[PDB]
Amino acid sequence: TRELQSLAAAVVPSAQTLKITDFSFSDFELSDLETALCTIRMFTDLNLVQNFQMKHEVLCRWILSVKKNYRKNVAYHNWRHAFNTAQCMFAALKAGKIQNKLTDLEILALLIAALSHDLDHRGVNNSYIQRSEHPLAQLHSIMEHHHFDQCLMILNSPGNQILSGLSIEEYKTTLKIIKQAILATDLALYIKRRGEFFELIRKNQFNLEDPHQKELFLAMLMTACDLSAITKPWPIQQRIAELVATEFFDQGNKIPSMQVGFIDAICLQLYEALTHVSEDCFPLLDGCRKNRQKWQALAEQ
């Protein structure tokens, strides 16, 4: 409650001041409270506070509840990863001008989903807890369903209901988009569905007015921001790879070639496709290409 008193009383600096419009954004120098103020600015500058009549105190309480339900003893899959994913979504909507291709309910759900998509992640080497639970459902996007459960629980918690200003129809619609968006962060679903996305772009058939292609695009965008650490400037990306390695190996050199393979198999084609959708998202592809060059030079020793 003392952290809530400081956050609700602080003046939120502008998006430019907070540098959240830049694809190169990094959070290493920010306090936890500073990350919360940037998150308020994301809601504010996307007009989510205005169009959906969000009480200031409820938004702050919701942001702090989301933050507290990430585990800091997890080296990468923590609150800062979710905060950065949301920042990339904000930068993609603003700096990439994607914002005008989507409705307010879709933008509202994407921001919420980005912030919530990894809630209560226990670390890649602690998947035994989600097996003590659901001992039969182990051989399903097991974790992404749990992440949405966590998100929904927080959205419904007293004093935390940032969607109370929505009508019941807008709420059901928003909840559905949130659910699909969080579930899309399952890389298996990404690999399963990315092929249809690429051929649509390749054949120049990509149609945002198609309800199926709009949903497909929302999934790809969630993956793009989820993995956006791979696009950051070289000093940032080196630090993130350190965090990924700690969670993976130390439950908290082979890394260069692992990063190059990850860029090739997963990342490069997605950011290539996204630039065909909007050339203003090119910095993500450019940053990813530069990082591959750096890791590959190290990989060759």
Ligand X SMILES: O=C(O)/C=C/c1ccc2c(=O)[nH]c(Cc3cccc(Cl)c3)nc2c1
Catalytic residues: 77
CB of 26 to Zn ion, least distance (A): 17
Residues 284, 278: contact at Cβ < 8 Å?
no
DSSP-derived secondary structure for 171-208: HHHHHHHHHHHHHHTSHHHHHHHHHHHHHHHHTT---T
- The verdict on 259 binding ligand X (CB under 6 A) reads yes
CA gap 12, 7 in Å, rounded: 9
Measured distance between the N- and C-terminal CA atoms of the chain, rounded to whole angstroms: 51
- The CA-atom distances, in angstroms, between 13 and each of 86, 89, 107 are 17, 19, 21
Q: Residue 254: enclosing H or E segment and its boundaries?
A: none
Query: x/- binding map, residues 99-118, to Zn ion, per CB under 5 A?
Result: -------------------x
Out of 229, 273, 274, 277, the residue judged to bind ligand X by CB under 6 A: 229
Query: x/- binding map, residues 97-126, to ligand X, per CB under 6 A?
Result: ---------------------x--------
Q: Is 259 annotated as a binding residue?
A: yes
- The verdict on 255 binding ligand X (CB under 6 A) reads yes
Judged by CB, which is closer to Zn ion: 137, or 187?
187
Residues 295, 219: contact at Cβ < 8 Å?
no
Dig out the tokens for 146 from the structure.
């749990």
- The verdict on 262 binding ligand X (CB under 6 A) reads yes
Tell me which stretch binds ligand X (CB under 6 A): 44-52, 141-149, 203-211, 241-249: 241-249
Judged by CB, which is closer to Zn ion: 45, or 118?
118
Q: Outline where the chain has alpha helix (H).
A: 2-9, 15-18, 32-45, 48-51, 56-68, 79-94, 104-116, 129-132, 142-155, 168-184, 187-202, 211-226, 234-249, 255-262, 268-277, 282-299
Residues that bind Mg ion (CB under 5 A): 118, 185
Which of Zn ion, Mg ion, ligand X, none does residue 259 bind (CB under 5 to 8 Å by kind)? ligand X
Question: Rounded to an integer, what is the distance from CA 153 to the centroid of its chain?
Answer: 19
Which of ligand X, Mg ion, Zn ion, none does residue 186 bind (CB under 5 to 8 Å by kind)? none
- The verdict on 299 binding ligand X (CB under 6 A) reads no
The binding site for Zn(2+) comprises 81, 117-118, 226
In the complex, the residues that contact Zn ion under the rule CB under 5 A are 118, 226
In the complex, the residues that contact ligand X under the rule CB under 6 A are 77, 81, 118, 226-227, 229-230, 240-241, 244-245, 248, 255, 258-259, 262
The binding site for Mg(2+) comprises 118
The binding site comprises 81, 117-118, 226, 259
